[PDB]
Amino acid sequence: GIPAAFRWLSNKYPKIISPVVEERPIVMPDGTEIPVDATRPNPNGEEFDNLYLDMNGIVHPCSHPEDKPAPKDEEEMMIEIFKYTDRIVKMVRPRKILMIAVDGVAPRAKMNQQRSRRFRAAQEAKEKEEEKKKAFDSNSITPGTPFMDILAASLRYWCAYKLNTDPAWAKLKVIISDATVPGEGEHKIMEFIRSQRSSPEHNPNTRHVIYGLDADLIMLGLATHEPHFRVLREDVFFQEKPFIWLHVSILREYLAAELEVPNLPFRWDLERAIDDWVFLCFFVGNDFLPHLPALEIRENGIDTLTAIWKDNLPIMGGYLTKDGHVDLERAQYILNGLAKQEDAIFRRRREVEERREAVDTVRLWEEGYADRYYEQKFKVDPKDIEFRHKVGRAYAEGLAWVLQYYYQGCPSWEWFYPYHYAPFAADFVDLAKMEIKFEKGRISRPFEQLMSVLPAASRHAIPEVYHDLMTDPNSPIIDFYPEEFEIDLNGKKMAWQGVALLPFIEMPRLLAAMKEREHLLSEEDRARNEPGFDVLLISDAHPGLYEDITSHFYSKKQGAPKFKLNPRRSDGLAGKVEKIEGYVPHGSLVYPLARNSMPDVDYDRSITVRYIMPSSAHQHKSMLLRGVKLPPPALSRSDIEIIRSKAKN
Ligand SMILES: [Mg+2]
Ligand SMILES: [Mg+2]
């Protein structure tokens, strides 16, 4: 999540946005809506092969809508989720692949972010009920909760149902990675794209679409280096219910003109430049690192960085980034160049705030702000300078972590930046002497992840055997679950902005307390605490791939219960599939919810198998694959010269 990053990019680079042409259903005089024929050519001018759904962006608006009355129970929420997701698929009309990615158990660095936004939701709910002196807890949208089990069963039904009914899903391969499969929803998509890209049969001109509002999807869309890539998102700025595209192909054109440097001692490569730009944007903040005090998106902090990056690029000897790895020796140039401007940036910020008028105790525009900053925000010794360097090394370690996470997959499931504030650029010293080594670490179980991201007010979603650890004042880990906590606005104006001063979980303590109680879990709960897997769903009308899996798995002359996919028989899908035990195909598709508001299908035309992404030793390369054909340029010489003339300022 990068707040204000979208409002910034769309203002600076306007041509990356275009409206989504959505065909609407015809409504009968009797009221019956006639569904949209999604087999007809896509009215957006192009045909999209793959559509990836960051699914939690659909679950949140349909469960706690801010604009309409909230649904009456979970079943009506699933119905809205069906209607919303169907509307999206009727818009994109994917022709080959459709991935449903629900947030699974995430790395420790993301869990601390999830812990923050979930602790705040509990306090907002308490403060909005004390002002009124059981609703749906938004924190149920968390991996491993009872709510996610309802959602998993509902998406399995709805996909099989659409494979049966909608004639535009015949050749469509549906991949469902539910909340029992570890991995952040954005990065389960990102890892699937990397796996297909490394396939020898892969189409270099695949048209990708990813859905979600998380600004991380823009960065990841750039990190794939698949040119034919769009981001589908709701027109959040609709004040004066539609959707908009964000053309990563066009954003690449804007970054081409924004970053091009004449006369370099080394070869200029737009692909390697985009990587450095993505790396540079980590400094303005995201889910894993705080923004540096000098860098704010609303202050053109990205422009400050790209300026310093262009000034140092000839003398660096090369780029900052190569395929997800950082040359910290070169990154030293960037931070040295920002430290020289920190003093002046804070002053320019105060001069703006003084003209906006015509309490702050740090006073970044006054001499000695660094001693006040660590004294009041980090709440440490201002005289301890080595501590400041440590925070710098911690932040630099985090930059290397996020870059590998985005480009090659999570390098450490246990690492996390252990401070609530960022250091100054002046505090990054001797970065060339760092030797960063990441251990993959231990992935959390669903219940452990729950205890790591939920507050005590949401313990309903947690097995009762653990509740005493969150509420008993004599609990050995009660210091992890405060009922009240301070939120530092840090100069910002709104309450959703700012830092939540929550203690960081010492994970060995939490795991030790949960192990002492695990033998009391029910047999159904022990099974819920185990990792699931991805599944592929196709219809019996999918050419080749359906005939293949019925032969290997469900014929009379069955062979191995797992075989690799040939991308010529499947519609370009690479990887292995495994037979699901206890599953007989073509039975009766039964609607899982109680009120039977969706039909049972007596003969299920769909078939479900376990899907296994390909895993190659060849890393994800930041390059244009052989055989790619770039889209015709969207920017004009007028466009380019405007971006260049402004970039010189
Ligand atoms: Mg994210
Ligand atoms: Mg997410």
Residue numbers in the entry: 2 to 134, 159 to 265, 305 to 422, 569 to 859
What does the paper say about this structure?
In this work, we studied the structure and dynamics of the essential 100-kDa eukaryotic 5′→3′ exoribonuclease Xrn2. The molecular basis of RNA degradation by Xrn2 and its cytoplasmic paralogue Xrn1 has been established by several studies. This Xrn core harbors the catalytic site, which has three crucial features.
Here, we found that the Xrn2 core from the thermophilic yeast Chaetomium thermophilum (CtXrn2, residues 1–875, molecular weight 100 kDa) fulfills those conditions. The active site of the enzyme is positioned in a pocket in front of the ‘tower’ domain helix (helix α4). In summary, our data reveal that the apo Xrn2 enzyme is in a dynamic equilibrium between the pre-translocation and post-translocation states.
